[PDB]
Protein backbone atom coordinates (compact mmCIF):
# COMPACT_ATOMS: atom_id res chain seq x y z
CA UNK A 1 0.00 0.00 0.00
CA UNK A 2 2.79 2.42 0.87
CA UNK A 3 4.73 1.54 -2.27
CA UNK A 4 1.70 2.22 -4.46
CA UNK A 5 0.68 5.44 -2.73
CA UNK A 6 4.24 6.75 -2.93
CA UNK A 7 4.38 6.18 -6.68
CA UNK A 8 1.00 7.88 -7.06
CA UNK A 9 2.04 10.92 -5.04
CA UNK A 10 5.39 11.17 -6.83
CA UNK A 11 3.62 11.14 -10.20
CA UNK A 12 1.25 13.81 -8.90
CA UNK A 13 4.04 16.12 -7.74
CA UNK A 14 6.00 15.59 -10.96
CA UNK A 15 2.86 16.48 -12.93
CA UNK A 16 3.06 19.99 -11.48
CA UNK A 17 6.86 20.17 -11.57
CA UNK A 18 6.87 19.51 -15.32
CA UNK A 19 6.91 23.32 -15.91
CA UNK A 20 9.98 24.37 -13.91
CA UNK A 21 12.57 25.02 -16.62
CA UNK A 22 9.90 26.51 -18.87
CA UNK A 23 8.87 29.02 -16.21
CA UNK A 24 12.49 29.87 -15.41
CA UNK A 25 13.20 30.52 -19.09
CA UNK A 26 10.03 32.55 -19.65
CA UNK A 27 10.60 34.81 -16.63
CA UNK A 28 13.68 36.55 -18.05
CA UNK A 29 12.47 37.50 -21.54
CA UNK A 30 12.18 41.17 -20.43
CA UNK A 31 15.91 41.44 -19.76
CA UNK A 32 16.47 40.89 -23.47
CA UNK A 33 13.87 43.60 -24.14
CA UNK A 34 15.41 45.75 -21.38
CA UNK A 35 18.69 46.56 -23.13
Amino acid sequence: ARRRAAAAALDNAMAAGARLEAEVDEQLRPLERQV
Binding site: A1, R2, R4, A5, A7, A8, A9, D11, N12, A15, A16, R19, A22, Q27, P30, R33, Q34
Partner: protein, 325 residues
Protein backbone atom coordinates in the same frame (compact mmCIF):
# COMPACT_ATOMS: atom_id res chain seq x y z
CA UNK B 1 -23.35 18.38 -13.72
CA UNK B 2 -26.72 18.71 -12.04
CA UNK B 3 -25.23 16.67 -9.19
CA UNK B 4 -22.65 19.32 -8.37
CA UNK B 5 -25.22 22.13 -8.39
CA UNK B 6 -27.59 20.14 -6.19
CA UNK B 7 -24.82 19.39 -3.72
CA UNK B 8 -23.63 22.99 -3.61
CA UNK B 9 -27.12 24.24 -2.81
CA UNK B 10 -27.76 21.52 -0.22
CA UNK B 11 -24.47 22.43 1.44
CA UNK B 12 -24.83 26.21 1.44
CA UNK B 13 -28.42 26.22 2.67
CA UNK B 14 -27.91 23.75 5.53
CA UNK B 15 -24.16 23.84 6.34
CA UNK B 16 -23.58 20.13 6.84
CA UNK B 17 -19.83 20.78 6.41
CA UNK B 18 -17.45 23.75 6.23
CA UNK B 19 -16.68 23.56 2.49
CA UNK B 20 -17.07 21.23 -0.48
CA UNK B 21 -15.20 19.90 -3.53
CA UNK B 22 -16.28 18.69 -6.96
CA UNK B 23 -14.99 15.38 -8.35
CA UNK B 24 -15.57 13.25 -11.46
CA UNK B 25 -14.57 9.65 -10.76
CA UNK B 26 -14.23 8.01 -14.19
CA UNK B 27 -15.06 4.49 -15.33
CA UNK B 28 -11.84 2.48 -14.77
CA UNK B 29 -11.44 3.77 -11.22
CA UNK B 30 -14.88 2.50 -10.25
CA UNK B 31 -14.16 -0.71 -12.13
CA UNK B 32 -10.94 -1.43 -10.23
CA UNK B 33 -12.54 -0.39 -6.93
CA UNK B 34 -14.80 -3.45 -7.10
CA UNK B 35 -17.96 -1.39 -7.64
CA UNK B 36 -20.06 -1.55 -10.79
CA UNK B 37 -21.84 1.29 -12.58
CA UNK B 38 -25.18 0.98 -14.39
CA UNK B 39 -26.62 -0.30 -11.10
CA UNK B 40 -28.72 1.50 -8.48
CA UNK B 41 -26.65 4.07 -6.60
CA UNK B 42 -26.96 5.42 -3.08
CA UNK B 43 -24.15 7.80 -2.17
CA UNK B 44 -22.88 8.68 1.29
CA UNK B 45 -19.71 10.17 2.74
CA UNK B 46 -17.94 10.88 6.02
CA UNK B 47 -14.78 12.68 7.09
CA UNK B 48 -12.37 10.80 9.36
CA UNK B 49 -9.61 12.76 11.07
CA UNK B 50 -6.24 11.08 11.43
CA UNK B 51 -4.47 9.84 14.52
CA UNK B 52 -7.61 10.07 16.65
CA UNK B 53 -10.40 8.02 15.10
CA UNK B 54 -13.31 10.45 15.35
CA UNK B 55 -15.70 10.18 12.41
CA UNK B 56 -18.43 12.69 11.71
CA UNK B 57 -21.76 10.93 11.05
CA UNK B 58 -22.46 10.08 7.42
CA UNK B 59 -24.12 12.56 5.07
CA UNK B 60 -26.05 11.67 1.93
CA UNK B 61 -24.94 13.38 -1.29
CA UNK B 62 -26.53 13.56 -4.73
CA UNK B 63 -24.61 11.58 -7.35
CA UNK B 64 -25.46 11.20 -11.01
CA UNK B 65 -23.66 8.66 -13.17
CA UNK B 66 -23.27 9.55 -16.83
CA UNK B 67 -22.77 6.78 -19.39
CA UNK B 68 -20.98 8.13 -22.47
CA UNK B 69 -18.15 10.69 -22.34
CA UNK B 70 -18.16 12.55 -19.03
CA UNK B 71 -15.51 15.26 -19.31
CA UNK B 72 -17.04 16.69 -22.47
CA UNK B 73 -20.45 16.91 -20.79
CA UNK B 74 -18.98 19.71 -18.68
CA UNK B 75 -17.53 21.49 -21.72
CA UNK B 76 -20.10 21.35 -24.54
CA UNK B 77 -23.70 22.40 -25.10
CA UNK B 78 -26.34 19.85 -26.17
CA UNK B 79 -27.59 21.03 -29.57
CA UNK B 80 -24.19 21.85 -31.05
CA UNK B 81 -22.17 18.68 -30.50
CA UNK B 82 -22.17 15.32 -28.79
CA UNK B 83 -19.66 14.31 -26.09
CA UNK B 84 -17.31 11.35 -26.39
CA UNK B 85 -15.08 9.27 -24.13
CA UNK B 86 -15.32 7.40 -20.84
CA UNK B 87 -17.89 8.25 -18.22
CA UNK B 88 -18.15 8.03 -14.46
CA UNK B 89 -20.37 9.31 -11.69
CA UNK B 90 -20.30 12.94 -10.62
CA UNK B 91 -20.06 13.47 -6.86
CA UNK B 92 -19.06 16.11 -4.32
CA UNK B 93 -17.36 15.34 -1.02
CA UNK B 94 -17.48 17.33 2.23
CA UNK B 95 -14.35 18.76 3.80
CA UNK B 96 -13.01 19.92 7.16
CA UNK B 97 -10.75 22.96 6.88
CA UNK B 98 -10.64 26.75 7.17
CA UNK B 99 -7.28 27.93 8.54
CA UNK B 100 -4.66 25.28 7.71
CA UNK B 101 -6.28 22.29 6.04
CA UNK B 102 -4.67 19.31 7.70
CA UNK B 103 -3.02 16.65 5.60
CA UNK B 104 -3.41 12.89 5.74
CA UNK B 105 -7.00 13.29 6.92
CA UNK B 106 -9.10 11.43 4.38
CA UNK B 107 -12.60 11.94 3.03
CA UNK B 108 -14.33 8.57 2.86
CA UNK B 109 -16.85 7.94 0.10
CA UNK B 110 -19.48 5.21 0.18
CA UNK B 111 -21.21 3.68 -2.84
CA UNK B 112 -23.59 0.71 -2.85
CA UNK B 113 -21.26 -1.67 -1.08
CA UNK B 114 -17.63 -0.50 -1.21
CA UNK B 115 -15.92 2.52 0.33
CA UNK B 116 -13.27 4.71 -1.28
CA UNK B 117 -10.84 6.96 0.56
CA UNK B 118 -9.45 10.25 -0.76
CA UNK B 119 -6.63 11.80 1.27
CA UNK B 120 -6.87 15.59 1.46
CA UNK B 121 -3.26 15.91 0.30
CA UNK B 122 -4.48 14.18 -2.88
CA UNK B 123 -7.86 15.85 -3.37
CA UNK B 124 -7.02 19.55 -3.21
CA UNK B 125 -4.54 20.93 -5.78
CA UNK B 126 -2.73 24.20 -5.19
CA UNK B 127 -3.06 25.88 -8.60
CA UNK B 128 -5.99 25.78 -11.01
CA UNK B 129 -6.12 25.84 -14.82
CA UNK B 130 -8.48 28.64 -15.81
CA UNK B 131 -6.35 30.07 -18.63
CA UNK B 132 -7.19 27.35 -21.17
CA UNK B 133 -10.94 27.85 -20.89
CA UNK B 134 -10.72 31.08 -22.86
CA UNK B 135 -9.23 29.07 -25.71
CA UNK B 136 -12.09 26.60 -25.28
CA UNK B 137 -14.82 29.25 -25.15
CA UNK B 138 -13.74 31.11 -28.28
CA UNK B 139 -13.92 27.84 -30.22
CA UNK B 140 -17.33 27.17 -28.69
CA UNK B 141 -18.70 30.53 -29.84
CA UNK B 142 -17.25 30.07 -33.33
CA UNK B 143 -18.96 26.66 -33.32
CA UNK B 144 -22.32 28.21 -32.53
CA UNK B 145 -21.70 30.77 -35.27
CA UNK B 146 -21.11 28.15 -37.95
CA UNK B 147 -24.20 26.30 -36.73
CA UNK B 148 -26.51 29.32 -36.88
CA UNK B 149 -25.16 30.28 -40.29
CA UNK B 150 -25.85 26.91 -41.90
CA UNK B 151 -28.89 25.36 -40.22
CA UNK B 152 -31.20 28.31 -41.01
CA UNK B 153 -33.55 27.95 -38.04
CA UNK B 154 -34.77 31.30 -36.68
CA UNK B 155 -34.07 35.01 -37.21
CA UNK B 156 -33.30 36.00 -33.62
CA UNK B 157 -30.45 33.49 -33.55
CA UNK B 158 -29.42 34.51 -37.07
CA UNK B 159 -28.75 38.06 -35.87
CA UNK B 160 -26.56 36.74 -33.04
CA UNK B 161 -24.72 34.55 -35.52
CA UNK B 162 -24.07 37.55 -37.74
CA UNK B 163 -22.75 39.54 -34.78
CA UNK B 164 -20.42 36.73 -33.72
CA UNK B 165 -19.28 36.47 -37.34
CA UNK B 166 -18.44 40.18 -37.48
CA UNK B 167 -16.70 39.91 -34.09
CA UNK B 168 -14.19 37.07 -34.58
CA UNK B 169 -13.09 34.82 -37.44
CA UNK B 170 -15.51 32.17 -38.74
CA UNK B 171 -12.74 29.72 -39.60
CA UNK B 172 -13.77 26.40 -38.01
CA UNK B 173 -14.24 24.74 -34.65
CA UNK B 174 -14.22 21.55 -32.60
CA UNK B 175 -14.17 20.88 -28.85
CA UNK B 176 -12.04 18.08 -27.41
CA UNK B 177 -12.14 17.28 -23.71
CA UNK B 178 -9.25 14.82 -23.60
CA UNK B 179 -6.93 17.48 -25.03
CA UNK B 180 -7.66 19.63 -21.97
CA UNK B 181 -5.85 17.40 -19.48
CA UNK B 182 -2.79 17.07 -21.71
CA UNK B 183 -1.93 20.37 -23.36
CA UNK B 184 -2.41 22.77 -20.48
CA UNK B 185 -0.15 24.20 -17.85
CA UNK B 186 -0.99 25.36 -14.37
CA UNK B 187 -2.11 28.98 -14.03
CA UNK B 188 -0.46 31.15 -11.37
CA UNK B 189 -1.76 34.49 -10.03
CA UNK B 190 1.32 36.49 -11.08
CA UNK B 191 1.83 36.35 -14.87
CA UNK B 192 -0.66 39.17 -15.65
CA UNK B 193 1.47 41.35 -13.38
CA UNK B 194 4.58 40.23 -15.26
CA UNK B 195 2.99 41.35 -18.53
CA UNK B 196 1.80 44.60 -16.92
CA UNK B 197 5.17 45.45 -15.37
CA UNK B 198 6.74 44.72 -18.75
CA UNK B 199 4.24 47.08 -20.41
CA UNK B 200 5.49 50.23 -18.67
CA UNK B 201 9.13 49.42 -19.36
CA UNK B 202 8.67 48.60 -23.05
CA UNK B 203 6.57 51.75 -23.52
CA UNK B 204 9.35 53.65 -21.74
CA UNK B 205 12.55 52.47 -23.48
CA UNK B 206 11.35 54.36 -26.59
CA UNK B 207 -23.19 44.29 -26.03
CA UNK B 208 -20.03 42.45 -25.03
CA UNK B 209 -18.01 39.78 -26.83
CA UNK B 210 -19.63 36.62 -25.45
CA UNK B 211 -23.09 37.53 -24.14
CA UNK B 212 -24.19 37.30 -27.76
CA UNK B 213 -23.80 33.54 -27.35
CA UNK B 214 -25.94 33.75 -24.22
CA UNK B 215 -28.79 35.79 -25.70
CA UNK B 216 -28.80 33.64 -28.82
CA UNK B 217 -28.39 30.12 -27.43
CA UNK B 218 -31.22 30.92 -25.05
CA UNK B 219 -33.43 30.57 -28.16
CA UNK B 220 -32.36 27.24 -29.70
CA UNK B 221 -33.15 25.11 -26.66
CA UNK B 222 -35.88 27.58 -25.72
CA UNK B 223 -34.89 27.21 -22.08
CA UNK B 224 -32.47 29.09 -19.86
CA UNK B 225 -31.68 25.82 -18.01
CA UNK B 226 -29.54 27.19 -15.13
CA UNK B 227 -27.42 24.04 -15.29
CA UNK B 228 -26.13 25.29 -18.64
CA UNK B 229 -25.00 28.73 -17.48
CA UNK B 230 -21.92 27.37 -15.74
CA UNK B 231 -20.82 25.74 -19.01
CA UNK B 232 -20.25 29.19 -20.51
CA UNK B 233 -18.37 30.45 -17.46
CA UNK B 234 -14.77 29.21 -17.45
CA UNK B 235 -14.10 25.89 -15.74
CA UNK B 236 -10.88 24.17 -14.71
CA UNK B 237 -10.35 20.43 -14.34
CA UNK B 238 -7.08 19.19 -12.85
CA UNK B 239 -6.29 15.56 -13.58
CA UNK B 240 -5.06 13.86 -10.41
CA UNK B 241 -4.14 10.36 -9.30
CA UNK B 242 -5.42 8.09 -6.52
CA UNK B 243 -3.58 6.64 -3.53
CA UNK B 244 -5.82 3.69 -2.69
CA UNK B 245 -5.80 1.92 -6.07
CA UNK B 246 -3.52 3.94 -8.34
CA UNK B 247 -5.70 5.27 -11.16
CA UNK B 248 -6.92 8.65 -12.39
CA UNK B 249 -9.78 10.96 -11.42
CA UNK B 250 -10.57 14.62 -11.95
CA UNK B 251 -11.33 17.52 -9.60
CA UNK B 252 -13.31 20.19 -11.42
CA UNK B 253 -14.00 23.73 -10.18
CA UNK B 254 -16.39 26.24 -11.73
CA UNK B 255 -15.77 29.98 -11.60
CA UNK B 256 -19.01 31.09 -9.94
CA UNK B 257 -19.00 28.01 -7.70
CA UNK B 258 -18.49 28.27 -3.95
CA UNK B 259 -16.73 24.89 -3.87
CA UNK B 260 -13.00 24.35 -3.44
CA UNK B 261 -11.43 26.32 -6.26
CA UNK B 262 -12.68 28.97 -8.60
CA UNK B 263 -13.63 32.30 -7.11
CA UNK B 264 -15.38 32.99 -3.80
CA UNK B 265 -14.18 29.69 -2.43
CA UNK B 266 -12.28 29.39 0.83
CA UNK B 267 -8.54 28.77 0.77
CA UNK B 268 -6.40 27.26 3.52
CA UNK B 269 -2.65 26.90 3.56
CA UNK B 270 -1.41 23.29 3.25
CA UNK B 271 -0.51 22.32 6.80
CA UNK B 272 2.58 20.54 5.45
CA UNK B 273 4.25 23.97 5.25
CA UNK B 274 4.97 24.62 8.93
CA UNK B 275 5.63 20.89 9.28
CA UNK B 276 8.35 20.99 6.63
CA UNK B 277 9.82 24.20 8.02
CA UNK B 278 10.10 22.85 11.57
CA UNK B 279 11.28 19.46 10.29
CA UNK B 280 14.19 21.23 8.62
CA UNK B 281 14.79 23.80 11.37
CA UNK B 282 15.46 21.60 14.39
CA UNK B 283 17.17 19.28 11.92
CA UNK B 284 15.38 15.92 12.04
CA UNK B 285 14.17 13.72 9.18
CA UNK B 286 10.68 13.03 10.49
CA UNK B 287 7.83 14.96 12.15
CA UNK B 288 7.01 12.27 14.70
CA UNK B 289 10.60 12.12 15.94
CA UNK B 290 10.59 15.84 16.73
CA UNK B 291 11.85 16.99 20.16
CA UNK B 292 8.86 17.46 22.44
CA UNK B 293 10.05 20.90 23.56
CA UNK B 294 9.79 21.86 19.89
CA UNK B 295 6.41 20.19 19.35
CA UNK B 296 5.05 22.29 22.21
CA UNK B 297 5.17 25.36 19.97
CA UNK B 298 3.43 23.56 17.11
CA UNK B 299 0.62 22.37 19.39
CA UNK B 300 0.54 25.92 20.75
CA UNK B 301 -0.07 27.31 17.27
CA UNK B 302 -2.64 25.01 15.64
CA UNK B 303 -5.12 22.97 17.69
CA UNK B 304 -5.25 20.29 14.96
CA UNK B 305 -1.72 18.91 14.99
CA UNK B 306 -2.03 18.11 18.69
CA UNK B 307 -3.04 14.45 18.98
CA UNK B 308 -0.63 13.17 16.29
CA UNK B 309 2.21 14.57 18.43
CA UNK B 310 1.33 14.63 22.14
CA UNK B 311 0.17 11.18 23.22
CA UNK B 312 2.76 8.43 23.56
CA UNK B 313 1.01 5.98 21.22
CA UNK B 314 -1.85 7.30 19.08
CA UNK B 315 -4.84 5.00 18.50
CA UNK B 316 -4.09 4.82 14.76
CA UNK B 317 -0.78 5.01 12.90
CA UNK B 318 -0.01 8.58 11.87
CA UNK B 319 1.61 10.09 8.77
CA UNK B 320 0.87 7.19 6.41
CA UNK B 321 -1.64 7.15 3.57
CA UNK B 322 -2.71 3.63 4.63
CA UNK B 323 -4.40 4.12 8.00
CA UNK B 324 -7.79 2.62 7.18
CA UNK B 325 -6.17 -0.32 5.40
Amino acid sequence: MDAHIANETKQQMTRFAPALVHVIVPDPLLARAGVDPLAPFAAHAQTRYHGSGVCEPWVSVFAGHVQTGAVESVLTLPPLQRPRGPGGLFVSLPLALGAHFDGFTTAALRVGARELVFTYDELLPARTRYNVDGERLERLCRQFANYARARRVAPAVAAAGGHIDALLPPAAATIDGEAQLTRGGFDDPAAPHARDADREILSLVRLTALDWLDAGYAALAGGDAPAHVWRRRPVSLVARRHYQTGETFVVVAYEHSTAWGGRRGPRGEPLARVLAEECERHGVEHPRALPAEARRELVRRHAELAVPLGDEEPPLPVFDATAEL
